[PDB]
Subunit: 204 residues, 3 copies
């Protein structure tokens, strides 16, 4: 369920989502505007990705976007993607954006991040390899690369973002497991759409 | 995707939403019961507004309801609207109910309010011109007009509600911007649903 | 929108949901895999219940699942249900899972529980007859039966779980009311899909 961006004083290109053929988007979801989805992305049910104000959005390869997630952006304000271009929202490679998370542009999330349940990133950079846990708010700050954020933290000042602990080895594996589970899920959903793949399994 | 209220021990009128022709409601949403939606309202994808228990709901002119929002109400309990009528939920004019907010009747939200990301108003009055920030709970209280609520606050007592700072000039300016932005989006989406409007635009590309 | 579980290294049975004819599931929602939904269950708009990683899920009789709720499970990790079978998610009878709640397996929620607005149970056991309020996180712990949890609490250690107050009689009556309300909603929505039932009601208008 994908649509063009609406014509507004700030946008007239009527841009539509670019989705990799290796990605899987569940039917029960809504995608509007210039949303660039690279290889092996899994977009789960109940999600609304809306690139009508702030635009464009980038979602990197092997990244998962889980149930009930919202992605939107402010009309004014951008970050620099790794390609040199400006984005309302940049999410890197091998990122997990988990259940009911909110990612609000301007926002940069680096490669390998885990963003936990019901957590929000708004007007903020989160460095590569961060593990952010459950019920967290991050707003108006830069989180250094490789940091761990405990559940329930409300981070609104740089002073707070500057005193976070380094991730442990167990956090790094925990994060890569979630990435792998969603790659496996994506392929299974693609198999079920194809008579040649699903028929032999269904006969057993 | 608009439906009548179901028949229950407390209701039998099977009421359906009244939507102003100048409003825009996204396809990917669900609307049930006596929901009265006024001029230039924008209702975004993922929203569930359900007037099957407490009823009616009123959503005022130039108000936006953003993605993943839920509105419901308790069967018992009402607020007095600006028209003298009883409502489960009353949302005024020029209001922003932003991403993932929950408004739960009995509730009154006054003209010009901003209700921030993932925030909840339940069994409460929020006076006109309040600016509520992110991840806030407001419950069983009255917030005076023109107050600012910092992010993360869990307000459950009147003692807390009585000790809030006044909104600042830059808060007002931020609130009005969000209102105007959404007015512009609704007219854009209506153009896309009209061949005469959107065709000449796609021709320029 | 009812879907089979996908073929995967941990599951190839392609299970689909089993839904009691006396349950009402709103159209605007998504169900995937081995989800066992019992008698008189109400599933509200905007819900996603997904048994593709952890599986199976169990939802008991007269239980309600309200708007925007998400249910999922870890691939590894199970709890024992009251039937003596293993589940990623067990939700018992006469339970309320309210607006925007998240239940994430491994999870057990006993009979008679109230789980409040925007609250989370993950890798946890919540005993029979608990009343959990609003904007709560319960994580990695066991809450004994008959306990009350104030709004906004973040419970991540057993030490917190061990110092909770008992429910009061008024909390019990409050919980059963919400269950009763949702049963009455359920039969109303079914009445509207039965011409015998809805025809005389509509002719009064
Ligand atoms: Cl939420
Ligand atoms: Zn926004
Ligand atoms: Zn309710
Ligand atoms: Zn999960």
């Amino acid at each position: 369920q994908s649509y063009a961006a609406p014509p507004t004083p700030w946008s007239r290109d009527l841009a539509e989502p670019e989705i990799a053929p290796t990605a899987y988007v569940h039917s029960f979801s809504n995608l509007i505007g210039d949303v660039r989805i690279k290889d092996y992305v899994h977009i789960a049910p109940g999600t609304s990705i809306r690139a009508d104000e702030g635009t464009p959005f980038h979602i990197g390869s092997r990244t998962n976007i889980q149930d009930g997630v919202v992605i939107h952006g402010l009309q004014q304000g951008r970050v620099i993607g790794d390609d040199g271009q400006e984005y309302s929202v940049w999410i890197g490679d091998n990122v997990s954006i988990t259940h009911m998370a909110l990612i609000h542009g301007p926002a940069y999330i680096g490669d390998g991040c885990f963003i936990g349940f019901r957590s929000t990133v708004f007007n903020a950079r989160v460095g590569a390899g961060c593990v952010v846990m459950m019920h967290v708010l991050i707003q108006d700050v830069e989180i250094p690369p490789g940091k761990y954020v405990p559940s329930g933290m409300v981070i609104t000042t740089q002073q707070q973002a500057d005193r976070l602990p380094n991730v442990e080895e167990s956090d790094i594996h925990f994060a890569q497991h979630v990435v792998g589970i969603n790659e496996a899920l994506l392929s299974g959903y693609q198999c079920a759409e194809n008579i040649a793949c699903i028929a032999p399994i269904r006969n057993e």
